[PDB]
PDB file of all heavy atoms in Angstrom:
ATOM      1  N   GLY W  37     -15.865  39.757 -45.827  1.00 35.35           N
ATOM      2  CA  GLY W  37     -16.498  40.888 -46.485  1.00 35.35           C
ATOM      3  C   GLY W  37     -17.026  41.971 -45.542  1.00 35.35           C
ATOM      4  O   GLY W  37     -17.674  42.917 -45.986  1.00 35.35           O
ATOM      5  N   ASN W  38     -16.752  41.850 -44.246  1.00 35.52           N
ATOM      6  CA  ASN W  38     -17.104  42.920 -43.309  1.00 35.52           C
ATOM      7  C   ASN W  38     -16.021  43.995 -43.223  1.00 35.52           C
ATOM      8  O   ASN W  38     -15.171  43.971 -42.330  1.00 35.52           O
ATOM      9  CB  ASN W  38     -17.433  42.379 -41.916  1.00 35.52           C
ATOM     10  CG  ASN W  38     -17.776  43.480 -40.933  1.00 35.52           C
ATOM     11  OD1 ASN W  38     -17.935  44.645 -41.311  1.00 35.52           O
ATOM     12  ND2 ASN W  38     -17.886  43.122 -39.662  1.00 35.52           N
ATOM     13  N   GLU W  39     -16.086  44.950 -44.148  1.00 34.54           N
ATOM     14  CA  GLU W  39     -15.073  45.988 -44.285  1.00 34.54           C
ATOM     15  C   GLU W  39     -15.227  47.075 -43.216  1.00 34.54           C
ATOM     16  O   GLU W  39     -14.346  47.925 -43.045  1.00 34.54           O
ATOM     17  CB  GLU W  39     -15.131  46.566 -45.708  1.00 34.54           C
ATOM     18  CG  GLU W  39     -13.973  47.460 -46.135  1.00 34.54           C
ATOM     19  CD  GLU W  39     -12.644  46.721 -46.222  1.00 34.54           C
ATOM     20  OE1 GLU W  39     -12.626  45.492 -45.982  1.00 34.54           O
ATOM     21  OE2 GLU W  39     -11.616  47.374 -46.527  1.00 34.54           O
ATOM     22  N   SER W  40     -16.325  47.032 -42.465  1.00 37.37           N
ATOM     23  CA  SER W  40     -16.581  48.077 -41.470  1.00 37.37           C
ATOM     24  C   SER W  40     -15.510  48.123 -40.375  1.00 37.37           C
ATOM     25  O   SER W  40     -15.292  49.158 -39.752  1.00 37.37           O
ATOM     26  CB  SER W  40     -17.991  47.949 -40.860  1.00 37.37           C
ATOM     27  OG  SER W  40     -18.088  46.868 -39.936  1.00 37.37           O
ATOM     28  N   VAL W  41     -14.816  47.012 -40.151  1.00 35.38           N
ATOM     29  CA  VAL W  41     -13.826  46.988 -39.072  1.00 35.38           C
ATOM     30  C   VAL W  41     -12.383  47.241 -39.545  1.00 35.38           C
ATOM     31  O   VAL W  41     -11.434  47.016 -38.798  1.00 35.38           O
ATOM     32  CB  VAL W  41     -13.927  45.684 -38.229  1.00 35.38           C
ATOM     33  CG1 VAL W  41     -15.261  45.651 -37.469  1.00 35.38           C
ATOM     34  CG2 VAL W  41     -13.767  44.441 -39.117  1.00 35.38           C
ATOM     35  N   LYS W  42     -12.227  47.718 -40.779  1.00 33.22           N
ATOM     36  CA  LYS W  42     -10.896  47.962 -41.353  1.00 33.22           C
ATOM     37  C   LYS W  42     -10.095  49.020 -40.571  1.00 33.22           C
ATOM     38  O   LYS W  42      -8.904  48.835 -40.307  1.00 33.22           O
ATOM     39  CB  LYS W  42     -11.020  48.340 -42.839  1.00 33.22           C
ATOM     40  CG  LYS W  42      -9.698  48.527 -43.601  1.00 33.22           C
ATOM     41  CD  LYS W  42      -8.810  47.291 -43.506  1.00 33.22           C
ATOM     42  CE  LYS W  42      -7.854  47.173 -44.681  1.00 33.22           C
ATOM     43  NZ  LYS W  42      -8.568  46.849 -45.957  1.00 33.22           N
ATOM     44  N   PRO W  43     -10.743  50.140 -40.206  1.00 31.32           N
ATOM     45  CA  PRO W  43     -10.044  51.117 -39.356  1.00 31.32           C
ATOM     46  C   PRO W  43      -9.561  50.530 -38.022  1.00 31.32           C
ATOM     47  O   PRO W  43      -8.447  50.829 -37.594  1.00 31.32           O
ATOM     48  CB  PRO W  43     -11.114  52.190 -39.104  1.00 31.32           C
ATOM     49  CG  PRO W  43     -11.996  52.122 -40.338  1.00 31.32           C
ATOM     50  CD  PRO W  43     -12.052  50.643 -40.677  1.00 31.32           C
ATOM     51  N   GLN W  44     -10.395  49.726 -37.366  1.00 28.98           N
ATOM     52  CA  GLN W  44      -9.994  49.092 -36.113  1.00 28.98           C
ATOM     53  C   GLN W  44      -8.820  48.116 -36.342  1.00 28.98           C
ATOM     54  O   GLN W  44      -7.886  48.060 -35.535  1.00 28.98           O
ATOM     55  CB  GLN W  44     -11.177  48.365 -35.452  1.00 28.98           C
ATOM     56  CG  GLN W  44     -12.293  49.284 -34.932  1.00 28.98           C
ATOM     57  CD  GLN W  44     -13.452  49.434 -35.921  1.00 28.98           C
ATOM     58  OE1 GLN W  44     -13.254  49.744 -37.104  1.00 28.98           O
ATOM     59  NE2 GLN W  44     -14.669  49.200 -35.438  1.00 28.98           N
ATOM     60  N   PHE W  45      -8.872  47.355 -37.437  1.00 26.08           N
ATOM     61  CA  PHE W  45      -7.749  46.481 -37.811  1.00 26.08           C
ATOM     62  C   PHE W  45      -6.436  47.262 -37.828  1.00 26.08           C
ATOM     63  O   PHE W  45      -5.450  46.871 -37.202  1.00 26.08           O
ATOM     64  CB  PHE W  45      -7.977  45.872 -39.189  1.00 26.08           C
ATOM     65  CG  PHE W  45      -6.931  44.862 -39.599  1.00 26.08           C
ATOM     66  CD1 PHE W  45      -6.947  43.568 -39.076  1.00 26.08           C
ATOM     67  CD2 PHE W  45      -5.954  45.195 -40.525  1.00 26.08           C
ATOM     68  CE1 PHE W  45      -6.001  42.625 -39.472  1.00 26.08           C
ATOM     69  CE2 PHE W  45      -4.995  44.259 -40.922  1.00 26.08           C
ATOM     70  CZ  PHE W  45      -5.021  42.978 -40.391  1.00 26.08           C
ATOM     71  N   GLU W  46      -6.436  48.370 -38.557  1.00 25.79           N
ATOM     72  CA  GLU W  46      -5.245  49.191 -38.705  1.00 25.79           C
ATOM     73  C   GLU W  46      -4.805  49.812 -37.384  1.00 25.79           C
ATOM     74  O   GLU W  46      -3.610  49.886 -37.090  1.00 25.79           O
ATOM     75  CB  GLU W  46      -5.468  50.258 -39.778  1.00 25.79           C
ATOM     76  CG  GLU W  46      -5.559  49.619 -41.172  1.00 25.79           C
ATOM     77  CD  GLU W  46      -5.841  50.605 -42.290  1.00 25.79           C
ATOM     78  OE1 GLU W  46      -6.073  51.803 -42.004  1.00 25.79           O
ATOM     79  OE2 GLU W  46      -5.832  50.168 -43.463  1.00 25.79           O
ATOM     80  N   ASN W  47      -5.777  50.236 -36.583  1.00 25.36           N
ATOM     81  CA  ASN W  47      -5.484  50.753 -35.254  1.00 25.36           C
ATOM     82  C   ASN W  47      -4.867  49.707 -34.316  1.00 25.36           C
ATOM     83  O   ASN W  47      -3.915  49.993 -33.598  1.00 25.36           O
ATOM     84  CB  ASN W  47      -6.729  51.370 -34.609  1.00 25.36           C
ATOM     85  CG  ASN W  47      -6.479  51.785 -33.175  1.00 25.36           C
ATOM     86  OD1 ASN W  47      -6.912  51.115 -32.234  1.00 25.36           O
ATOM     87  ND2 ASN W  47      -5.740  52.872 -32.999  1.00 25.36           N
ATOM     88  N   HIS W  48      -5.409  48.500 -34.308  1.00 27.09           N
ATOM     89  CA  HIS W  48      -4.843  47.479 -33.428  1.00 27.09           C
ATOM     90  C   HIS W  48      -3.438  47.024 -33.867  1.00 27.09           C
ATOM     91  O   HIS W  48      -2.599  46.696 -33.023  1.00 27.09           O
ATOM     92  CB  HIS W  48      -5.800  46.302 -33.228  1.00 27.09           C
ATOM     93  CG  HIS W  48      -7.015  46.655 -32.422  1.00 27.09           C
ATOM     94  ND1 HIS W  48      -6.930  47.199 -31.157  1.00 27.09           N
ATOM     95  CD2 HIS W  48      -8.331  46.560 -32.704  1.00 27.09           C
ATOM     96  CE1 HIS W  48      -8.148  47.420 -30.695  1.00 27.09           C
ATOM     97  NE2 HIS W  48      -9.020  47.044 -31.615  1.00 27.09           N
TER      98      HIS W  48
END
Side-chain angles (χ1 to χ4, degrees):
Chain W
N38 179 9
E39 192 65 2
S40 74
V41 294
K42 184 56 154 290
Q44 292 96 309
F45 185 77
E46 291 177 355
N47 174 256
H48 291 304

